[PDB]
Design a protein around this nucleic acid. Structure first.
Lengths: 107, 98, 9, 79, 92, 92, 107, 79, 104
DNA sequence: TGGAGAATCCCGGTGCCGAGGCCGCTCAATTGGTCGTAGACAGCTCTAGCACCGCTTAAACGCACGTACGCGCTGTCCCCCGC
DNA sequence: CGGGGGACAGCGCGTACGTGCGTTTAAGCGGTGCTAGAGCTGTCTACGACCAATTGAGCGGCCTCGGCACCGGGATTCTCCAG
């Protein structure tokens, strides 16, 4: 009414809080949805997105590109064992796998 | 004519090095869509499939086949072998629970 | 006494 | 239309195994690969048909395929 | 009509973590589906955690437990640190 | 002390209906109770995500029928929904 | 009012419609819950319970046992193909595994 | 308490294999079996610890144990 | 006596192993002793919340779940040994089963 | 151990197709009140978990000989690969 | 269709648990004692829901563009050499 400042900017988060709160209320996941819970979820989503985008940018620097393609995202996810454990039963479209060569198959 | 023909097994590694890092798809769109129509004909008829749904189905099937082929190759090199067999696929299916 | 092995008792 | 399991091409199966790092492919691999692809495809298509018949729809959308893959724990991104 | 998406927010994250790179539209859809899937998993875990102990609300501890359950290890504890930093920034 | 929700008498009368001379031990009955609770949770979650997909705030018998066709494979679901069908045919 | 009659007897069911409705409403699965959904869920649960207990009794009939023990439930679950497919990721306590021997192991 | 990883005895692993249908048992299977058992046990135990600090509880309940098992898709029936 | 100086019945390697398989896949008892399992449970909680108690029902549930997971892994290992034209199981078979299942 | 075949890499230039940046608007985002209500919170039971000990006996540790499967080396020719 | 090569069977070594026995030892039964927080319920109190008003950045759409992909040329590089 006086000055509408976003609560995501109050916590220093780029990811929204009102959208997360509205989606939590719309799905009826609980009778009440707290105040710090969407902020925590937005911060965790921001950290995950920043880490995955940083790994994808590193892979794009390795293969000399500046635009992140689905192959770069797949390589970033499947490179470290942390995201491999997290995204174990998750597949990514428009992407392959690591170009690993077995020692026995090598001539 | 051919001075060299490339000993067997190394052209396979050439296609491996080309296609593990590749981005374009391998299964052709039209026969996969036709197989989708044949499969859906056994289910409720007068059914349609949009381009995005067919693309998602093709990507999921190719990813599942890639994972199954990786498991099959791992089982083949596990059995002191190099060639993959249908029994290796059956073993991978039994281990994975599918 | 079962010396060494059980045998047929 | 009635016989379309031969539409899955044998060198396409070869390319799929080359993406999987397979060096040597036997001749009996192709038929078993077509069979497992057929049963997986018919399971996912049956799930998508049920999903699109709950919504009183006659065309299957990509979101139906995404939710069908999420039902079996094989969630795919991009759609 | 309107379509809810996280595309522009992910763009701000990208320019705040990598100011010299971009991202394609198919990769944008992949990012949107990834964000939706992680949000779905964490929200379902938090709702289950509230349901198990007769709790009708979702607090910061619900998302704390969901993150320490679903997210593994080092990634999980950095997400925990980021969430606690955001909570402390809100309470300050 | 406090009352606890359980599926004891219902599973027992179903067992007596199908097997008048066969009992059940406590451990196996706890397994059956947990099986009923887990199938209830799975069907409820499937119907919830089906209703959220269609922007539907109402879960009817059609959502339960769709969930039983989805989760339960083969003909085992079909007779089940057929039972549900005659259940509706006995309710209306 | 009038005579109290449960909805399970009206629908020809043994599983409680009202208890299933209560767990559906308090389980925050949806904002609104239909009348036929608890009846359908109770019918499905009753049919599955009857089938599983009948299979357990059949597996325990030749074992000279008139009581259902967890081994009988495990045998009934893993013997049926559709029950094995549905309960693929299900662990049954005090049940073990099926007593099957491979042909190569037998001399 | 400092060292009881040898508590899972070798004949116990032998009986584990005899339930699993194994005919002959090697001497190097025990260390890897104990290692993967330790990994799975510590994963489920850390999940149960997260569940028990969710509700300010110092003890671990079997209900939380089967919930943690259901979280990883290995749900246990009868507790 | 025993047909002269002789020796025990002396079953060949494998026969009493299938006897153990037959008698031991149907008695559905517990294969790991409870106190060593509880001691191992308390050991691997020392890098965790240290002052933590464990219920008897929770200990039994964890023991049963780990036992079932281990016998499923042993079934996978035996099928991988038969896959490799072998009878004995190797730790590399366990690694293969865990990698195919997604746990390695 | 210096030439071919095939194959990938590099480079300059160009088509162009999404990629990225900018303006109105709105509907979802933010702000300001109450208020039942669910969640902390603190004083009670007391349930079941933790700790120590006698005994024993069946599970378990270590040793003794053996054979049967694991492993090393060959041949066929049939199946698979390169074109 | 021509060539490669290795799966499977065979033969031979080998060795290490298999089975059993002598010896150890702690799992478990049973008991007693202590006690930490599950759990229970009354009480206080901020908090999210709800609603009215307001304003504001994402959405839709549009304009310009620039790196992705590709088409010509040229080389580094794997492979198999017969030497």
């Amino acid at each position: 009414r006086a000055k509408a400042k976003t609560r995501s900017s109050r916590a220093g988060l780029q990811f929204p809080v009102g959208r997360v709160h509205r989606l939590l209320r719309k799905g009826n996941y609980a009778e009440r949805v707290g105040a710090g819970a969407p902020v925590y979820l937005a911060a965790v989503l921001e950290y995950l997105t920043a880490e995955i985008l940083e790994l994808a940018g590193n892979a794009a620097r390795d293969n000399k590109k500046t635009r992140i393609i689905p192959r770069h995202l797949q390589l970033a996810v499947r490179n470290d064992e942390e995201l491999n454990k997290l995204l174990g039963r998750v597949t990514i479209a428009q992407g392959g796998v690591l170009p690993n060569i077995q020692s026995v198959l090598l001539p | 004519k051919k001075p060299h023909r490339y000993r067997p097994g190394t052209v396979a590694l050439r296609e491996i090095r080309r296609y593990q890092k590749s981005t374009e798809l391998l299964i052709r769109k039209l026969p996969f869509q036709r197989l989708v129509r044949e499969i859906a004909q056994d289910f409720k008829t007068d059914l349609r499939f949009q381009s995005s749904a067919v693309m998602a189905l093709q990507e999921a099937s190719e990813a599942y086949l890639v994972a199954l082929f990786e498991d099959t190759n791992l089982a083949a090199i596990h059995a002191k072998r190099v060639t993959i067999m249908p029994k290796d696929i059956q073993l991978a299916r039994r281990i994975r629970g599918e | 006494h079962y010396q060494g092995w059980k045998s047929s008792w | 239309l009635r016989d379309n399991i031969q539409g899955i091409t044998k060198p396409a199966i070869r390319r799929l195994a080359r993406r999987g790092g397979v060096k040597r492919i036997s001749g009996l691999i192709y038929e078993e690969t077509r069979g497992v692809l057929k049963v997986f495809l018919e399971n996912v298509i049956r799930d998508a048909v049920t999903y699109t018949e709950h919504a009183k729809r006659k065309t299957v959308t990509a979101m139906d395929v995404v939710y069908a893959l999420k039902r079996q724990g094989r969630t795919l991104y991009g759609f | 009509t309107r379509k809810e998406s996280y595309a522009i927010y992910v763009y701000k994250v990208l320019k705040q973590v990598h100011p010299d790179t971009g991202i394609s539209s198919k990769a944008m859809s992949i990012m949107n589906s990834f964000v939706n899937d992680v949000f779905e998993r964490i929200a379902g875990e938090a709702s289950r955690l509230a349901h198990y102990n007769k709790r009708s609300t979702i607090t910061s501890r619900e998302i704390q437990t969901a993150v320490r359950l679903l997210l593994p290890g080092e990634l999980a504890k950095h997400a925990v640190s980021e969430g606690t930093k955001a909570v402390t920034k809100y309470t300050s």
